[PDB]
Amino acid sequence: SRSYPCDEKVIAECSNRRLQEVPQTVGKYVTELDLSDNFITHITNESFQGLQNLTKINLNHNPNVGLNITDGAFLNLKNLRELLLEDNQLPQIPSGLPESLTELSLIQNNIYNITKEGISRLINLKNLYLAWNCYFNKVCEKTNIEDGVFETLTNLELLSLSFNSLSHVPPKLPSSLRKLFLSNTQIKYISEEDFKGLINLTLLDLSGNCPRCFNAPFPCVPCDGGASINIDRFAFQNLTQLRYLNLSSTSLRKINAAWFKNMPHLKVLDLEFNYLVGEIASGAFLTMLPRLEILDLSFNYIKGSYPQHINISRNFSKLLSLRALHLRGYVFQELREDDFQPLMQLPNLSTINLGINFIKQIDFKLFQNFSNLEIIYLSENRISPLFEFDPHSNFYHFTRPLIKPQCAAYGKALDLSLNSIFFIGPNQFENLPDIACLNLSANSNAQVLSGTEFSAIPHVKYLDLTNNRLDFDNASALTELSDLEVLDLSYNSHYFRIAGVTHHLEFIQNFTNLKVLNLSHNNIYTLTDKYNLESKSLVELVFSGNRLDILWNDDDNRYISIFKGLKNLTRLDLSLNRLKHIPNEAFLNLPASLTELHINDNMLKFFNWTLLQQFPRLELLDLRGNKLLFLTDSLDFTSSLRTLLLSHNRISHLPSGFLVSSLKHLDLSSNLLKTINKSALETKTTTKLSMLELHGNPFECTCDIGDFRRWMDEHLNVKIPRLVDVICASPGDQRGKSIVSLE
Amino acid sequence: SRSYPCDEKKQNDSVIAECSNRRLQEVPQTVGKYVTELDLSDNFITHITNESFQGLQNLTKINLNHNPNVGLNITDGAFLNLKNLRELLLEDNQLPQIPSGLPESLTELSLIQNNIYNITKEGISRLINLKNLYLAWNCYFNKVCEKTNIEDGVFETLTNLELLSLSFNSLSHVPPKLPSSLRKLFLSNTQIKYISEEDFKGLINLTLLDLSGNCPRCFNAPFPCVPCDGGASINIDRFAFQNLTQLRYLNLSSTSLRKINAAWFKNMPHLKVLDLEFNYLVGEIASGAFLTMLPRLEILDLSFNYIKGSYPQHINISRNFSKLLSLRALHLRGYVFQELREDDFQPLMQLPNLSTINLGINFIKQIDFKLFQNFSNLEIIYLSENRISPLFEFDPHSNFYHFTRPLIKPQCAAYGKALDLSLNSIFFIGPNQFENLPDIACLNLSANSNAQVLSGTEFSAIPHVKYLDLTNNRLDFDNASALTELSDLEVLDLSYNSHYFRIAGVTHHLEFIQNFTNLKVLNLSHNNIYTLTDKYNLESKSLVELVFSGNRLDILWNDDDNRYISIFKGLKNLTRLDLSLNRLKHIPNEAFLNLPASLTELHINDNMLKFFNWTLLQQFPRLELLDLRGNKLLFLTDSLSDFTSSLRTLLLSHNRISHLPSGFLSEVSSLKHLDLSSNLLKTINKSALETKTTTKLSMLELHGNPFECTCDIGDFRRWMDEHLNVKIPRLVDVICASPGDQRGKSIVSLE
Numbered sequence A: 001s002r003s004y005p006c007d008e009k010v011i012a013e014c015s016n017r018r019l020q021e022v023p024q025t026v027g028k029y030v031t032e033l034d035l036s037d038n039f040i041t042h043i044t045n046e047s048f049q050g051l052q053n054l055t056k057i058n059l060n061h062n063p064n065v066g067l068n069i070t071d072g073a074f075l076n077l078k079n080l081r082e083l084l085l086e087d088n089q090l091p092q093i094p095s096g097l098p099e100s101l102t103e104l105s106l107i108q109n110n111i112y113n114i115t116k117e118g119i120s121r122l123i124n125l126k127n128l129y130l131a132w133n134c135y136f137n138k139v140c141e142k143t144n145i146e147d148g149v150f151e152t153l154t155n156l157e158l159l160s161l162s163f164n165s166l167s168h169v170p171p172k173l174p175s176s177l178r179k180l181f182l183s184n185t186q187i188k189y190i191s192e193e194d195f196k197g198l199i200n201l202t203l204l205d206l207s208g209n210c211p212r213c214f215n216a217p218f219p220c221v222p223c224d225g226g227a228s229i230n231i232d233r234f235a236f237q238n239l240t241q242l243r244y245l246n247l248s249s250t251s252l253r254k255i256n257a258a259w260f261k262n263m264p265h266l267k268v269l270d271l272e273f274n275y276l277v278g279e280i281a282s283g284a285f286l287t288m289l290p291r292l293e294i295l296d297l298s299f300n301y302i303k304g305s306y307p308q309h310i311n312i313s314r315n316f317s318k319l320l321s322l323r324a325l326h327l328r329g330y331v332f333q334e335l336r337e338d339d340f341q342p343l344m345q346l347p348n349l350s351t352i353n354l355g356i357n358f359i360k361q362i363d364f365k366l367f368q369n370f371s372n373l374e375i376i377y378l379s380e381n382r383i384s385p386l387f388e389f390d391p392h393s394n395f396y397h398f399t400r401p402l403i404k405p406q407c408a409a410y411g412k413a414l415d416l417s418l419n420s421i422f423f424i425g426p427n428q429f430e431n432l433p434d435i436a437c438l439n440l441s442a443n444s445n446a447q448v449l450s451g452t453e454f455s456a457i458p459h460v461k462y463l464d465l466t467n468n469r470l471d472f473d474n475a476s477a478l479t480e481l482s483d484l485e486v487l488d489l490s491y492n493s494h495y496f497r498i499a500g501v502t503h504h505l506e507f508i509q510n511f512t513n514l515k516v517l518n519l520s521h522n523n524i525y526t527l528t529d530k531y532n533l534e535s536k537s538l539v540e541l542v543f544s545g546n547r548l549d550i551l552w553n554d555d556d557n558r559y560i561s562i563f564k565g566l567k568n569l570t571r572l573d574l575s576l577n578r579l580k581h582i583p584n585e586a587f588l589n590l591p592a593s594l595t596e597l598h599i600n601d602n603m604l605k606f607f608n609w610t611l612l613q614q615f616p617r618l619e620l621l622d623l624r625g626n627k628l629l630f631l632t633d634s635l636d637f638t639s640s641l642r643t644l645l646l647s648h649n650r651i652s653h654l655p656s657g658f659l660v661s662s663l664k665h666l667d668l669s670s671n672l673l674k675t676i677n678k679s680a681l682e683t684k685t686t687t688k689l690s691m692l693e694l695h696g697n698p699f700e701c702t703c704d705i706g707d708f709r710r711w712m713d714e715h716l717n718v719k720i721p722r723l724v725d726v727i728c729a730s731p732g733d734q735r736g737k738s739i740v741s742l743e
Numbered sequence B: 001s002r003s004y005p006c007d008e009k010k011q012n013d014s015v016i017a018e019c020s021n022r023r024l025q026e027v028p029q030t031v032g033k034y035v036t037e038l039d040l041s042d043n044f045i046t047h048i049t050n051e052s053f054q055g056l057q058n059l060t061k062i063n064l065n066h067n068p069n070v071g072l073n074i075t076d077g078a079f080l081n082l083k084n085l086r087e088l089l090l091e092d093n094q095l096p097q098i099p100s101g102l103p104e105s106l107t108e109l110s111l112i113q114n115n116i117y118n119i120t121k122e123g124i125s126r127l128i129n130l131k132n133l134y135l136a137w138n139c140y141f142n143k144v145c146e147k148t149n150i151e152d153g154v155f156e157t158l159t160n161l162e163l164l165s166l167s168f169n170s171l172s173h174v175p176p177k178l179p180s181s182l183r184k185l186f187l188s189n190t191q192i193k194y195i196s197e198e199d200f201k202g203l204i205n206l207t208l209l210d211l212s213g214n215c216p217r218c219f220n221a222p223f224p225c226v227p228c229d230g231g232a233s234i235n236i237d238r239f240a241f242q243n244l245t246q247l248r249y250l251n252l253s254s255t256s257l258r259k260i261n262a263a264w265f266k267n268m269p270h271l272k273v274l275d276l277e278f279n280y281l282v283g284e285i286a287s288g289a290f291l292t293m294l295p296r297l298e299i300l301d302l303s304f305n306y307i308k309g310s311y312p313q314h315i316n317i318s319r320n321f322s323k324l325l326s327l328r329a330l331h332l333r334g335y336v337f338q339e340l341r342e343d344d345f346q347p348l349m350q351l352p353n354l355s356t357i358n359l360g361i362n363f364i365k366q367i368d369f370k371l372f373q374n375f376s377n378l379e380i381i382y383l384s385e386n387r388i389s390p391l392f393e394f395d396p397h398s399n400f401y402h403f404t405r406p407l408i409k410p411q412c413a414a415y416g417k418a419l420d421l422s423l424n425s426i427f428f429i430g431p432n433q434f435e436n437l438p439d440i441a442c443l444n445l446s447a448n449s450n451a452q453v454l455s456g457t458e459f460s461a462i463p464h465v466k467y468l469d470l471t472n473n474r475l476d477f478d479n480a481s482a483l484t485e486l487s488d489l490e491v492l493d494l495s496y497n498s499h500y501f502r503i504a505g506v507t508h509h510l511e512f513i514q515n516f517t518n519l520k521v522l523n524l525s526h527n528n529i530y531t532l533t534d535k536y537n538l539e540s541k542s543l544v545e546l547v548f549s550g551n552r553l554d555i556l557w558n559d560d561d562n563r564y565i566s567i568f569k570g571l572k573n574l575t576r577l578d579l580s581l582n583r584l585k586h587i588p589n590e591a592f593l594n595l596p597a598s599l600t601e602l603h604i605n606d607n608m609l610k611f612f613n614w615t616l617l618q619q620f621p622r623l624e625l626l627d628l629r630g631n632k633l634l635f636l637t638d639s640l641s642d643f644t645s646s647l648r649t650l651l652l653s654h655n656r657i658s659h660l661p662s663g664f665l666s667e668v669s670s671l672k673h674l675d676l677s678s679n680l681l682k683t684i685n686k687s688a689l690e691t692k693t694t695t696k697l698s699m700l701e702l703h704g705n706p707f708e709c710t711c712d713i714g715d716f717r718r719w720m721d722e723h724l725n726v727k728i729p730r731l732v733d734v735i736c737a738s739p740g741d742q743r744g745k746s747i748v749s750l751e
């Protein structure tokens, strides 16, 4: 049958549905139940009375804008393995939890007391998350950890107590632990006893203890006098399995090399937001990490200091397994070749990260002297022409890839974005490696590209030129990049805005391998001499955020064939072009090779459906966010349409038998359908419709809805998502309830 | 006595009825019988007949433009029942012909943007009182049209015609037999290749002649452009303007002129404005004998005369330019040249009244700024949109070849000499960028991608700037002495400088605001401010208006952080504060109580507020305007009168208020303007309509509410009847939503 209120694929997706109590209509065979972001206020032993096969329960953020849990409310669920109770304003750990629990997360509550009565019986616990309960300027209490409360959990592998006021590492920790998170715990001193027996530990996070608070984007409290964290010389002597060490924001001025004497597997060392400029120049500890792969030393700048060069110790040459060196926020003016000599013979160093250093000039000749550089990240510098925090993410840096993977996959990547290379000189890219991926976005480049600017790096396959002010006055622009496959020219509207200047786009045709071209948000409304775009290779063209409403206006025919010359085109995005109307000849001149057409977010008051006959490969047609009022009677016009997106229009009536042929996905949500008559379901053929979206329609829940209700019951192969949002607008006794909950 | 469907206003004892854009299908017969001016524009009216305007005889002007909205059938003599109509507006109506039977009373008739290709004598020659006749934009561009047939001598009868505009129709020749009463003649884009002597021989009182767009310059045209055979110039004879002694405006833009006959201007010594845009006059600008024949010329526009494919080192200005002693503004856009030296503008430096020089869109790379000091009195130096580096889609009522907007915003130019360097690439300001400059009072450095750390010495050479535009840059605020050398600075615009503000790891210092004694207006909008360094408060004993829209007060006033709780309190003189577009889901009670008590205007619109602590208004005794539009407010307070004695305007549109609290229109007798439009009000019952008191409530907006139009409405309906002093705008949109018998229907339309 059709599940309600949840969607059961056995997991029951039942989140964000404005539920006020645990639904009693959940299938008795569900394995995992996700009830997050609902308005649930109480949990008793009757709430999950019929779901004894439950292993995972998600009750995060309830009620959405506290959660009362009775003692033993979960006790009857003897298969409950994972219980997520985040953002519930819980004042205590819930009493009488099932001993079958292996993962429990109480992140972001008001729990200031970790008691034996609450935790010391869940001896099967492997992951325990208690982070973010008392932090910053929250009015809260210092965390009380009963002596030996974790001593019972002999199978505990992960313990997270970060962002609580602990002041001391808890004693009597089980030696089964592999990951210990103690970030922002006000722990000023690490004794020799604190981790004496954790011989299985692979991760240790002591970040944010005695923090560096200058320019902190959060309420920050330094240790007395901004002193360093006090780590005993033998505090790590038995952590021989450690792979991850996070010492970010611990006010370190000196790194004791003896910390790593017995740490042969250390792979990632985080040292952000310290005062390690002197250690970077000396680096006695660097001798001890020949297996280290990632070293983050970012934001160690000295306040008010803008040195001429970066001082990299020669001992960086001992990091023989280094693959990624992160040196953001060191702040220096010039990168000379000899400054990076200690790094030039590392065999696996493929990522160098020098973002946000206010570097004025770089001798790009030095990057060729490297063994295996794959990612050169120089974004956000000063190079000139030649609750607030996600508790489940990294706190001191974003974890997204430095360069988009679609660009980095082509080969070596150079990122010069967010600088002020406002024009490319003739020798800007001399003595560089064979760059395949180049990011020059947001440089305010206003120059006329002619066909020589990228001659020194002619093998670029993916070129990012977004957010500039490029001046297209040469038909030979970018033609020296004959192997170019992806070109991004989004947000270059500066000169396209001005009618009096020339706009030449003819260079598009001089490419044999160009596949992806993005001209979005350029305000294109006039072109010079050649009015048509032409390419025999181009596969995808993104033309959103332009003025096709002007290019195709009724008193102008020069642009009637603007896209016809894109003979290989399969994907075309015409969204956000302010189109109230598409001339029939202009639509008929779109490439017949199209398989995907987006005309969403315009102002289309009418769509000529019969013209679809000239597009036998059209699988996807996107017309969401328009003002369409009518559908065609005999959709005779296509045998290829698999997806029809029509949400946010003004359709008030559905044609007879519309629910067609190869249509598998039909989106009619957010329209003006009051009902779906029996005429629309009087289909001859057997339907292949697998998803039909109808939420947001002002359905009239009288007796006339019964014919469509039975159609739903007959076709359970047609998945109707968000049935809780397919809501009756009429009559008053049904306004607010789902159409599936009537007589 | 409340009007419907039109809004009947009053203007110097005249009666206007504003009835535009109301989805009307027929001309309403409920207008007042005293109305003199009726605006029925932008409706869905399809027919105009004998009976469409019965009994409305003081009617002097009618606006039927844009009908129907997204043709208009006018029957013969549908107006002649009138006796006083002087102005008839019939624009954009798809009329196939000039309507027949229009009254002899017409002094102005506008037929712009129709399908009229036949100017017959039946239609126009009977209207002896016509002063202005508009027929432009009927066959133009690639529109499927017909050539304009002008019946010979049809304008011969209108001996009172002062304005005739036939622009953007295919005329081929200047119409013969024009009445000598003509003072303005528009023949733009009319495919008139030749101007003979008989063409304007009899119009001795003409003050403007528009011949633009004939034999046009078609390169880079933003419209379908058809040049004369071989790109030839327009052919105007030597004596074509000999009898035009009263001409003050001459438009010859886009006529592909290569040479100008100086004798054309011999007998027009009063010519004030000469438009020569979009031609090929680079040679005439350097030689130019005609420049000696314009002694009273005040405005000379030579823009976009560039030679295609040419990028000369310097601009070549004839020394005969010094003969333009009455010149006030020189527009030299689109000349395209690399360098501006002081020797190149010597012919201009002795003109007494030259105040505006416009050099935009020239791709100038270097300018010797010392040349502007030698000018007698330059007030506007427009150098926007160049390449300086560190040292229907056309409005038928606007100019077709340039925008008529002021070059500098008037609020800036009012302070004195203005220098516009916007839209260049001055990405940092060197120690001598502004040396040898005049006493600049108004400086526009916007959109230069400037990433400099201002530190107090960048503007020393021009220390009397009162209005500084630094918008759309990437400024780096790491110095507390930034801009402090501009001691007289009164307006500082720092909009759209979010580049470094969004990076949490770099510093953001805003302490320099306090060092100004005369700063009145500060705009920090759309900067994404959410973290500051060291000092968390904005302080100024002079600041009057702070625009803080488009920032992140939702993060700054986060519940787990109190550092920014008094961010605005140190603005002791602040009277206007804009906190819109800050994604606020709630304001902490202590945060609102720390807003400056001197506030009279507070904007918190377009956020996400679901609750508002109305009690806190007790601490703002001068608050006159509270703008809470575009939020998610669910309730109103029982006790607004107990919380404020000063609030005059309360804007609450686009919220979720479904109930009006009892006694909401009495008691509060400082409130003149209450906006409850686009809310969730289903009814307003008698209890909220109590009036104890004085009630200064004058305006009450309610359109967009889903009104329950049963008999419960009846009491609010009769509250409207008994309170005509309360204007309720747009009754057409105060619409019943239920039941279906009255849906889509205005609430005054009911028994």
Ligand SMILES: *[C@@H]1O[C@H](CO)[C@@H](O[C@@H]2O[C@H](CO)[C@@H](O[C@@H]3O[C@H](CO[C@H]4O[C@H](CO)[C@@H](O)[C@H](O)[C@@H]4O)[C@@H](O)[C@H](O)[C@@H]3O)[C@H](O)[C@H]2NC(C)=O)[C@H](O)[C@H]1NC(C)=O
Residues within 6 Å of the ligand: A179, A183, A203, A205, A207, A244, A245, A246, A268, A270, A391, A392, A393, A394, A395, A396
């Ligand atoms: C100090 O440095 C530490 C070492 O880098 C940081 O630790 C990391 O912390 C983040 C933030 O929570 C963790 O990220 C999460 O990991 C979980 C679990 O991931 C695993 O399992 C899933 C499927 O079960 C799998 O897909 C993943 O790839 C993992 O194998 C994710 O569910 C979250 O979405 C999020 O990614 C890291 O896992 C953790 N690193 C390690 C090695 O455990 C620590 O955050 C730093 N301290 C601060 C204050 O930032």
Ligand SMILES: *[C@@H]1O[C@H](CO)[C@@H](O[C@@H]2O[C@H](CO)[C@@H](O[C@@H]3O[C@H](CO)[C@@H](O)[C@H](O)[C@@H]3O)[C@H](O)[C@H]2NC(C)=O)[C@H](O)[C@H]1NC(C)=O
Residues within 6 Å of the ligand: A406, A407, A466, A486, A488, A490, A516, A517, A518, A520, A540, A542
């Ligand atoms: C300019 O237009 C291009 C072409 O569409 C944009 O690039 C593309 O961005 C989409 C995301 O909208 C990428 O699709 C995705 O790939 C990921 C990773 O495999 C996948 O998980 C997603 O489901 C989705 O399929 C697409 O790969 C990417 N194409 C290329 C060649 O990079 C680009 O983002 C636009 N630029 C701007 C500034 O908007």
Ligand SMILES: *[C@@H]1O[C@H](CO)[C@@H](O[C@@H]2O[C@H](CO)[C@@H](O[C@@H]3O[C@H](CO)[C@@H](O)[C@H](O)[C@@H]3O)[C@H](O)[C@H]2NC(C)=O)[C@H](O)[C@H]1NC(C)=O
Residues within 6 Å of the ligand: B384, B405, B407, B408, B409, B412, B422, B423, B444, B445, B446, B447, B469
């Ligand atoms: C400093 O230079 C900048 C760059 O030219 C000036 O900005 C421009 O300002 C004008 C006037 O506000 C904008 O024009 C208008 O657009 C609005 C909305 O589209 C419209 O309602 C008005 O009728 C007018 O047409 C123009 O778009 C804008 N351009 C850019 C690129 O920002 C700025 O005004 C100058 N500052 C001073 C004090 O003069």
Ligand SMILES: *[C@@H]1O[C@H](CO)[C@@H](O[C@@H]2O[C@H](CO)[C@@H](O[C@@H]3O[C@H](CO)[C@@H](O)[C@H](O)[C@@H]3O)[C@H](O)[C@H]2NC(C)=O)[C@H](O)[C@H]1NC(C)=O
Residues within 6 Å of the ligand: B411, B412, B471, B491, B493, B495, B521, B522, B523, B525, B545, B547
């Ligand atoms: C940055 O914020 C300032 C301060 O509000 C903005 O300036 C002001 O813009 C308003 C219009 O939004 C001007 O108001 C108007 O003045 C005209 C002319 O008198 C009047 O006809 C209107 O009814 C309205 O009252 C105001 O004068 C002006 N103030 C100043 C000192 O220039 C500015 O536009 C904002 N900048 C950006 C880029 O948003």
Ligand SMILES: CCCC[C@](C)(CO)Nc1nc(N)nc2cc(F)cnc12
Residues within 6 Å of the ligand: A448, A471, A472, A473, A500, A501, A502, A503, B306, B307, B308, B309, B310, B311, B334, B336, B361, B363, B387
């Ligand atoms: C105002 C339009 C100039 C038209 C013309 C002559 C075309 O060649 N010139 C230039 N057009 C463009 N688009 N950019 C340039 C940049 C320069 F630095 C110099 N000249 C040009």
Ligand SMILES: CCCC[C@](C)(CO)Nc1nc(N)nc2cc(F)cnc12
Residues within 6 Å of the ligand: A301, A302, A303, A304, A305, A306, A329, A330, A331, A356, A358, A382, B453, B476, B477, B478, B505, B506, B507, B508
């Ligand atoms: C990573 C932020 C460094 C913070 C610190 C040391 C503040 O003094 N430095 C600079 N901060 C800012 N905001 N801008 C600059 C620009 C420069 F050219 C040089 N240094 C700075």
Ligand SMILES: *[C@@H]1O[C@H](CO)[C@@H](O)[C@H](O)[C@H]1NC(C)=O
Residues within 6 Å of the ligand: A347, A348
């Ligand atoms: C490190 O680089 C060398 C090249 O000298 C290569 O042989 C080796 O496989 C690399 N190591 C890893 C782990 O990729």
Ligand SMILES: *[C@@H]1O[C@H](CO)[C@@H](O)[C@H](O)[C@H]1NC(C)=O
Residues within 6 Å of the ligand: A379, A402, A403, A404, A407, A417, A418, A439, A440, A441, A442, A464
């Ligand atoms: C280029 O840099 C910009 C700015 O950092 C970034 O938004 C964009 O994703 C980058 N592009 C690629 C392909 O990495």
Ligand SMILES: *[C@@H]1O[C@H](CO)[C@@H](O)[C@H](O)[C@H]1NC(C)=O
Residues within 6 Å of the ligand: A450, A451, A473, A474, A475, A476
């Ligand atoms: C393109 O630029 C090159 C180099 O500046 C130039 O030689 C060529 O003429 C240009 N092509 C044009 C303007 O069509």
Ligand SMILES: *[C@@H]1O[C@H](CO)[C@@H](O)[C@H](O)[C@H]1NC(C)=O
Residues within 6 Å of the ligand: A512, A515, A536, A537, A538, A539, A568
């Ligand atoms: C058409 O697109 C396909 C898919 O990328 C590509 O393989 C083919 O080469 C393109 N056609 C031409 C002529 O380049």
Ligand SMILES: *[C@@H]1O[C@H](CO)[C@@H](O)[C@H](O)[C@H]1NC(C)=O
Residues within 6 Å of the ligand: A584, A608, A610, A611
């Ligand atoms: C749809 O396009 C066809 C052209 O094939 C045309 O004949 C038809 O009139 C169009 N329909 C509408 C409603 O304009």
Ligand SMILES: *[C@@H]1O[C@H](CO)[C@@H](O)[C@H](O)[C@H]1NC(C)=O
Residues within 6 Å of the ligand: B589, B613, B615, B616
């Ligand atoms: C409004 O703020 C005051 C603080 O003066 C507080 O006492 C009151 O409870 C607040 N009201 C609401 C509804 O939060």
